[PDB]
Symmetry: D4
């Protein structure tokens, strides 16, 4: 569609990515990055369109996407980037940075709730209703459905709007600096997950 | 004694602190920094001596100690600094930095155990036996005992040796960079505790 | 509307408050009184109308409201006042007293259920249906919605009726004196929460 | 012995009780006041002696002891009075008041520990070592042993000293008024236990 | 109605109770028999009608009902009689016997499910749909509603049919003798609850 | 019906079972094989039809079914065979082998979900909707309903299709050999359950 | 020794068993009666001697012992008979009755403790110290050690004394009738364990 | 010593390994095989001697040891081999087989205990006392102590004796065939741990 562009392996070029921030999510075969391969990278430049990239089994390279991940002048926006950063670094060898995580930002601003999921925060902060996929999905299937493409695009089409509102909320309640320090540490948090500390809060007493 | 110098309120001067790193621990009336006041700051320059500083109720200033806390050329070493950093910042208004935490370093190197306490790590890494205080102590008492001074000094007399060994272990097992990123975030972790997130892992999914 | 009067900062006068009891609830940015500021005070004189007062960030005074909180001849009615008392005392410096808590009264009379929420008790005791807000709300927003005003008013429009029924039930089942002693202690329970015992039952053995 | 006077049923007179405060503990057949009868009342006037009173099965009266329990000019000191107050009220029909509870006072002062037992607090605050009975005891036996008398006396011989130190600590750390309000509520807390709320914190949200 | 007869205090006579078994349930102010008084006794002779008896506060006698409870030639049927037996014995002084409990019988026959409630078993075994009361009810109210009378009658109108089917099932699967021994012990189980063992399985190892 | 053939005791012949694999499920009186007898064996040759066999109380033999269970050239397919294998071996004396378990295969392929039930996997992998029985069923009843026959047939009508898809998925993700080893062990896992280890993971450390 | 007589298979005669009560315990290969065979029966006539009987694998008969188990004029005393009754009935086909259980009696009298083990109760009630075996024992070994014989005898040498004291305590505290009803049900409790309800309190609500 | 031979990297030859079974244990930097490298392999031919082999960081080959691991005519004995098999396969690329696990064998024979550790089973089955290392050990240190060598040797010096006794016990209690099937599956259990199922019982229902 005009909203969703589908690609195999990689972005074909970076013509749509002359931007200062990109929105990213991924799909995998599960929550264990060492067992469960990367299957889809979905990315948006923030212009109301999304690119959905099917990643093949054994695929080691994605040079155009990786240029964006490495580019320190482009902020990579995620809603809970802790997992996606680990998956992307494990797949292609680059830990993306710098980052903004709308879930960490939500935890530091939406102090009146424990519901920090994407659907809930988009409804509350943006008045945008995104549908949540209910059945489980084999994201490694050779053929992805239009419904799958739409679900993947919905994960990234609104993160720039969400970041804009959350930045205002962080400033209003006085937590911009702490959020930024969390974003600076997040790539290390993801590295530590890959290294074997995924089940440990490294800052806990015991 | 020759090993332990006792002071009221503050260090009398910084003559013993022409160093690149200091070792710090604190004593309080309990684990709630907003309720339980700072009572003692114990600090060592790493030369086999320690200064034990009694902090009065309502004391807002400690200018010589605070110079060290602010000095970015001096690394502040703690064994679990997450609590002490919050207590010190709350008492005197300065978040100490930069820091090295031997407990975080232990968690990243001593992967074969869940025992990361000071007594255990000093025995294993330094062949130094420190006695652990068994009974509870009112650290806000007007008069501190020699036993209390000795317990407080034992917390700081060995942290430079511990840091030296842990740096070697971090290099051997390939985790120096991740440890350093943890140390850079730790002051923010302590700020977040004071701000109201003491019971939350900010990086957890939910 | 005729039922709901909206105000900034404070009641404009006490013309509507020549009464022996007032009904109060609050809205905040969350459940931590030290982190999460007071945002709204909703209050009713018991005449079927409510005042909804928007509290600004950093607001230290609300003299007309505070006159009511201090007035020992006016009983302050809450449904679970433990939290609101702490929030009000923290915001304006006065611990409201005396108080009547319809949730404590419910626990001492409705011995056949564990459901002591406002909606449930209003339905059972008053045959009044109040709608419960389902989505989370930023009560610190500059502009409050009519729906928010209606939710806040619903919290206080029925507490006088609820107190009247619960007083009858307390007398019927013989627990008036014990309830009154609970109400006398409740301001101290709220003070202890602010002081650092919010997670502790002070009367428990261990 | 000169330290311990043994009596059947009641104090023989109040000659030793021309005092402003008495220290009390009890022994029963267990922790359920409705099932497990009162067996012993131990009481001290604070002069370094104790009276140990054996209570018979079915005993409904103890007039000299009850005079002390009713006397509003005599403070009844307990270490955790919540249980003893319920047992005494159930046995003889009078809820003792006013009271001072050294365990509540410990919880409000000894903020650095979770160990609030009598042996621990006597060691820390008084430098007094009391032996703790290790084996279980049938306190309803017709014949009580000297060891049992000594254990019972040890529960009351030091509560006046403990109260004196805890009052100083409450003043030092600013919690005298809150402690006093807890002491005023404690008789109601015990009544509520007898009434059927022994397993419920009446002040909890849910 | 023709199905439901309402009475104050007691059955007016035993004309409808020339039977070998009666079906009984009760309503109280809650689950604590010592705190929560008996409010309603509902009873059926098994002929498709029910008597609903309102019990007053402080009522110590119900001679016609009690004749049935004492009559050893009449089996008292309950669905979970453990509670009702305790409540009835506490109210009127007679422990009813002999008994048949359809919930114990269900546990010994319906080995394929953990759902042993009255509504579920009536649907499965009898093809009878009974409506379950959803809101909480003050059964001590002076005036009981027709809905309350219908709920109470539904508890007893089908227990004879249920017992007939469960007896067949007990015989089919070979557990009649064990069920009967459970029924013989059940009055003691209820006595032990009143005596202070309500929270203990007396047959457990620890 | 043409889809479902009903039999008492055993298959009447093996005319429909000249196949290399059969699909099996069972119904019992519950989850304890020593207490809860086998009641129904449902089996399909994979041709879109099913045989539902009612097993009598005390039935020790089923020679035609048992020929299939013993035939090493016929793979017995189950969705979670651990229970059915134990039940069948206990009833007729033969541990069926070899086996394919679609639930183990699901756990080794559907790494993105914890929902491995038959209804969920048939929907996802086969686009087949099977209805799940909601009420509990006495499968030992003399007369089985058509609904019961349809539920039992639905358990086996699709396992050949499910196995075909799961074999493809096991090959795609590289786990065929591990799945096969699990299938070889499964009969022993079921034997160990019958022997007294039903609640123990024999491979766990402790 | 003079205190302990060892036998293979069975008592050689009943010359020592012309008594009204016997004390019994057993040893097995574990706590699962269906998996773990009976290995030893230890029995005392109450005269300060014990018989220790080694039971062979596959042994189905023990006629002299079984005469005692069946004899309704002989009370079988156990400390926690729930397990031994199941083991004995499973081994030889007779459920022993009538019984007295000193552990149930302890639970109904020693209301001040949760420690109802044999060693603890013998110390408290009898002033008898029995040594507890610390290492695990293969009770199915062909050759039993003298230490094993002494441990087994210690289980039965004191149960008559224990029963005598517990009967006095049951009378003193008014629970003789309830204890007797528990003893009458206990054989059924053991039957229900063998039947498949070992992990269920049959009298619980859910 | 004569009992313990130390080697770097690998066995120097297989002169001592002309045997049908070898006993193996390992030391690592922790319990995560992907993070925590293999540090020591200890192995015994069963002749009362042991070889302790220090494995270097990054060591990919150990050809003499690997010959033994691959040799299908040599049974590899472990006490809990699930972990060691994963570690060895991950280090050198060969999954050792066939295997005998004395911990699985203990679980299938020592049905009277939950203590299946090496020290406990050696004491009970062999009357051999092995000392357990109490402090934590950095097994990756360049220099291993004699105490470390002795601890490592103690893990393997007795496994042949243990296997001999456990084989007798498996035969006595009738579980040889089930144990053998467990041993055949164990290499797959270890593979599944490496593949990402270390925290899942693959045979559980859910």
């Amino acid at each position: 569609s005009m909203t969703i562009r589908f690609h195999r392996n990689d972005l074909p070029n970076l013509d749509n990515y002359q931007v200062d921030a990109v929105a990213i999510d991924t799909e995998t075969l599960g929550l264990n990055p060492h067992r469960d391969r990367l299957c889809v990278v979905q990315i948006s430049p923030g212009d109301g369109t999304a690119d959905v990239i099917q990643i093949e089994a054994g695929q080691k390279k994605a040079p155009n996407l990786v240029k964006l991940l490495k580019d320190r002048s482009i902020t990579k926006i995620f809603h809970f980037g802790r997992f996606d950063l680990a998956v992307l670094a494990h797949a292609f060898g680059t830990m993306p940075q710098p980052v903004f995580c709308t879930k960490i930002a939500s935890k530091l601003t939406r102090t009146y709730t424990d519901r920090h999921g994407l659907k809930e925060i988009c409804s509350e902060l943006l008045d945008v209703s995104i549908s949540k996929q209910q059945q489980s999905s084999d994201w490694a299937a050779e053929v992805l459905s239009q419904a799958q493409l739409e679900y993947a695009a919905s994960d990234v089409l609104y993160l720039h709007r969400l970041k804009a509102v959350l930045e205002q909320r962080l400033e209003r309640d006085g937590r911009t600096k702490q959020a930024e320090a969390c974003f600076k540490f997040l790539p290390t948090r993801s590295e530590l997950d890959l290294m074997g500390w995924a089940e440990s809060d490294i800052f806990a007493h015991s």
